[PDB]
Structure 1
Amino acid sequence: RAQLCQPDAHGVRRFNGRPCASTTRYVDGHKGACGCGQKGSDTPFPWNLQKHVTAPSERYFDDGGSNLWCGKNCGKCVRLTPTGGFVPGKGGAPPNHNPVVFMVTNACPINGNEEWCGISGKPGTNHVNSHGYEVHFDLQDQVGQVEALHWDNPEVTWEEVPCPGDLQANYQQCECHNS
Structure 2
Amino acid sequence: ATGGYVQQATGQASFTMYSGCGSPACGKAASGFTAAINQLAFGSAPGLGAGDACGRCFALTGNHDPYSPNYTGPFGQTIVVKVTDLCPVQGNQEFCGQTTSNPTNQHGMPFHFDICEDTGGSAKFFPSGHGALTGTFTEVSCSQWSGSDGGQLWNGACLSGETAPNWPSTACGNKGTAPS
Q: TM-score w.r.t. structure 1 length?
A: 0.67
Contact 1:22–1:153 under 8 Å retained in 2: yes
Q: Does 1:60 find its partner at 2:41?
A: yes
Contact 2:115–2:121 under 8 Å retained in 1: no
Shift of 1:100: 1.0
Which residue pairs with 2:26 in the alignment?
34
Contact 2:79–2:125 under 8 Å retained in 1: no
- List gaps (5 residues or longer) in structure 1: 1-17, 37-43
Alignment partners' CA distance in 1, 2:119 and 2:58: 20
Write out aligned runs for 1:95-174 (5 A): 95-96=74-75, 98-121=77-100, 127-151=103-127, 152-164=131-143, 167=146, 170-171=148-149, 173-174=151-152
SS in 1 for 2:35: strand
The RMSD of aligned alpha carbons is 3.0
- List gaps (5 residues or longer) in structure 2: 1-9, 161-171, 173-180
Which residue pairs with 1:176 in the alignment?
158
Q: Give the number of aligned pairs.
A: 144
Q: Deviations over 1:85-141 (max 9, x none)?
A: 111259x665345311110001000111111000003xxx87100110000000000
Q: TM-score w.r.t. structure 2 length?
A: 0.66
Provide closer, same or farther for how the CA distance between residues 99 and 165 of structure 1 changes in structure 2, counting only shifts above 3 A. closer
Q: Which runs of 4+ in 1 moved over 4 A?
A: none
Which residue pairs with 1:74 in the alignment?
54
Match for 1:75: what amino acid? G
Contact 2:89–2:98 under 8 Å retained in 1: yes
Q: Deviations over 1:53-103 (max 9, x none)?
A: 0000001010xx5365211110011111122x111259x665345311110
Alignment partners' CA distance in 2, 1:171 and 1:30: 11
Match for 2:57: what amino acid? C
Alignment partners' CA distance in 1, 2:83 and 2:49: 12
Write out aligned runs for 1:11-50 (5 A): 19-36=11-28, 44=29, 47=31
